[PDB]
Write a protein that binds this ligand. Sequence first.
Ligand SMILES: *[C@@H]1O[C@H](CO)[C@@H](O[C@@H]2O[C@H](CO)[C@@H](O[C@@H]3O[C@H](CO[C@H]4O[C@H](CO)[C@@H](O)[C@H](O[C@H]5O[C@H](CO)[C@@H](O)[C@H](O)[C@@H]5O[C@H]5O[C@H](CO)[C@@H](O)[C@H](O)[C@@H]5O)[C@@H]4O)[C@@H](O)[C@H](O[C@H]4O[C@H](CO)[C@@H](O)[C@H](O)[C@@H]4O[C@H]4O[C@H](CO)[C@@H](O)[C@H](O)[C@@H]4O)[C@@H]3O)[C@H](O)[C@H]2NC(C)=O)[C@H](O)[C@H]1NC(C)=O
Ligand code: YEC
Ligand code: CA
Ligand code: CA
Ligand code: K
Ligand code: NA
Ligand code: ZN
Length: 804
Amino acid sequence: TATSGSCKGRCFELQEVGPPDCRCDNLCKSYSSCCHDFDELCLKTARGWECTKDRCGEVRNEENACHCSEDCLSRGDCCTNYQVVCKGESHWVDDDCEEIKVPECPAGFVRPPLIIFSVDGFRASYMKKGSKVMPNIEKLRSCGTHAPYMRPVYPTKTFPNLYTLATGLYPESHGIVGNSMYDPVFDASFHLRGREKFNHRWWGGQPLWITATKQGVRAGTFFWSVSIPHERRILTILQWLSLPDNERPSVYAFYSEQPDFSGHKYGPFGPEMTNPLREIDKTVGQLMDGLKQLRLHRCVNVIFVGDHGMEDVTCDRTEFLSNYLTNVDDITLVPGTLGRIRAKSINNSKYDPKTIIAALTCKKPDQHFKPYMKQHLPKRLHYANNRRIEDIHLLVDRRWHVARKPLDVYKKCFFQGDHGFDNKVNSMQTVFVGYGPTFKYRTKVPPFENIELYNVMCDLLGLKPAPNNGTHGSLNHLLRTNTFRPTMPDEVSRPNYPGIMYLQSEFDLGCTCDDKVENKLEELNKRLHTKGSTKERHLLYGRPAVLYRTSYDILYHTDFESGYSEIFLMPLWTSYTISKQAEVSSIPEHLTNCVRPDVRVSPGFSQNCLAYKNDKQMSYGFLFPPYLSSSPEAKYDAFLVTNMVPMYPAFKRVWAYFQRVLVKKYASERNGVNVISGPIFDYNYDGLRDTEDEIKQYVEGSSIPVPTHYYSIITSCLDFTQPADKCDGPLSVSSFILPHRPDNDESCNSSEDESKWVEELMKMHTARVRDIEHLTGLDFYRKTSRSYSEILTLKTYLHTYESE
Ligand SMILES: *[C@@H]1O[C@H](CO)[C@@H](O[C@@H]2O[C@H](CO)[C@@H](O[C@@H]3O[C@H](CO[C@H]4O[C@H](CO)[C@@H](O)[C@H](O[C@H]5O[C@H](CO)[C@@H](O)[C@H](O)[C@@H]5O[C@H]5O[C@H](CO)[C@@H](O)[C@H](O)[C@@H]5O)[C@@H]4O)[C@@H](O)[C@H](O[C@H]4O[C@H](CO)[C@@H](O)[C@H](O)[C@@H]4O[C@H]4O[C@H](CO)[C@@H](O)[C@H](O)[C@@H]4O)[C@@H]3O)[C@H](O)[C@H]2NC(C)=O)[C@H](O)[C@H]1NC(C)=O
Ligand SMILES: CNC(=O)c1cnc(COc2cc(Cl)c(C#N)cc2C(C)(C)C)n1C
Ligand SMILES: [Ca+2]
Ligand SMILES: [Ca+2]
Ligand SMILES: [K+]
Ligand code: NA
Ligand SMILES: [Zn+2]
């Protein structure tokens, strides 16, 4: 750097000048590249940050941090409280809240500006528990639009979540997969400290500032240097807002290190936390009083958002890998609130993942972490499809840490708070408030995920979002105006509707059934069932649409409808309705091993029983459960070869319990349920439906592909006084994506009765409908009475199974 130039007139300039000139933008600090006079000119502190009676109409003194002189409003650099002190105006927080029906902006303003006010470690329950000391924030919240909480992404760390906020992408896709990383292809290490985290090759996707800039919208800085005080960040934003129309940004960001910084030291609700909350609130008050001075307080959209929460964590709640492994010096642990394990040395081919996992599995009765291969993590975490994510992962229980060895924890108790846990954990939830002309007035919306906000911020700014993991339209209910008008994806493949085309003897599948048992009243009756007479009952929301090119058949049955894939030789989906009144029966003894050819579907597009017999690892289950047949006669339908799917014995324990006990429990509790079940194939763990040439496992000696997962979507009436099959209004859904594993090693209590571990597994693997859509290429809920935006909201819902 040639730091011999000057910042005279360039303080916090918006486009950084190119070396070897010296820099006066607000990253210069972080690159050792500021001009000599940067602090003197750009970081004035004289006389502090508030006008007092005695400074009112003072003579402009340019050494002052901010001004109380008569010309300050026009120069854009008054103290934020100037009008209050010197002109008898009220602080914004003292004014009543008044609906902002239209943007009330100064002339020259082409669009309401957006200000993102992000707060580090701002746990969701602060909104209620700290309400008495955060009057500015509470006004934004009750007068604007707010959720009870906002769900972060995993891991629930700072950089992964702020870059998710800026890109609408999962960390696996944007690349910032933790607060430290190693990247083998670069051979390189990213960390919180140091210079490496500033190289742009870490940062994938297209962040909002780049989306804005490419489309003609100017942006303020998103990164603030740690040595620029909050008061100066606010004044800088308010100065930028007084720039001329051609130079003025439309989007801005402010970031606070608090309350995170204190939360680490004192825990989430430590007595020391009251003051940081007060201070953030005061900052908010400064921004709003500043906006109001500039007549922007009914023009700008403000988003108050957190990156993650904070939990009680102490040194004594640390699990040490040295207590599990003998070989603890052959590994590298990325430690703390998650674990990632790789080999110390890439030249040691005597590193075995399998033995490391087994040595960490169910080894202590109260073990506070669970090892996973990353592809076996819950699909809701979307945490696998990146080379920077180690194959071995430890999911750590809330309130705990994991470390390699004790020396790592004392030759580094300091801390009483931390974060980074599973993003379903209550203590990790954070906040969202939207306030402004474009947000709704005094509106509460349901909790949603921070991946959705990029689309909305783009809407707010009139930008076309780059491709992202949001579901555009799912947050339209936040907005007064600027709604995105989404439409349903076009169906790509039309189904076939086969009739009876094959005689029994044409099949040689090696199946038997005990079913030679032969009436005219109920001969027309069953024909009606195979043409789809009951389909209105079992298919409540329309048939799912297939969004890729393939060959499939719709099959109707008395108790269930299916979309049967000629390519994968099993249903893509199976739909059935179980009313509150329905009865569970058993599989009669004579029908235990019964599998029946489907005369609507050719031998060449059918599974066969001989493959399952020959495959010593692999067994089979059914998508529509025999246990819920409406009649002895209807039960034969459930044993069609077209309803069969490959299942490991270990997995049949889970599936049988779900189908025999849980479906009926849910129907009783929810007043009927509609169930859609099916297979998922994600051998490359990218969260996306595999093509057939990606399948790595088949049922031995066959073309029957083995699913990696099985899903179910379980829908009912949100008003549970109406039965699922006659619901007039909004729906309620829960879903899961269970991993199809040949062991139950994941469940430490799996030697017990299914009543003690199965449901807990299923909860862990709760999913959004949207997650199943990505994994299957299906589009659900195509025919309802609800608006499409409401259905998009429903498809993004996750049932978390946390308490309140
Ligand atoms: C969440 O939303 C995101 C965003 O929409 C979804 O991610 C997209 O998924 C698409 C499908 O997987 C994917 O499209 C592929 O990308 C190739 C072009 O890629 C570059 O350009 C874009 C655009 O500017 C850019 O964003 C990409 O950025 C990635 O890579 C850099 C590092 O290079 C990172 O800085 C960044 O973080 C990002 O990394 C992530 O993505 C890559 C994959 O792109 C992952 O490997 C990483 O782990 C990380 O997650 C890229 O720089 C394109 O070349 C591909 O084309 C192949 O496949 C198609 C199939 O139709 C076919 O036409 C061709 O045959 C072609 O095959 C040839 O190449 C093969 C592989 O080299 C080879 O085997 C063949 O034999 C052939 O030679 C493909 O279109 C898109 O890139 C990403 N976008 C992002 C931002 O991640 C994501 O799916 C959503 N998640 C869910 C769950 O829904
Ligand atoms: C040690 N210093 C820091 O950690 C630091 C300094 N300034 C910031 C704020 O950064 C952001 C803010 C917002 Cl609001 C968004 C969004 N959307 C994105 C970012 C990133 C991190 C992508 C630049 N941080 C985290
Ligand atoms: Ca943080
Ligand atoms: Ca896949
Ligand atoms: K078998
Ligand atoms: Na087990
Ligand atoms: Zn932190």
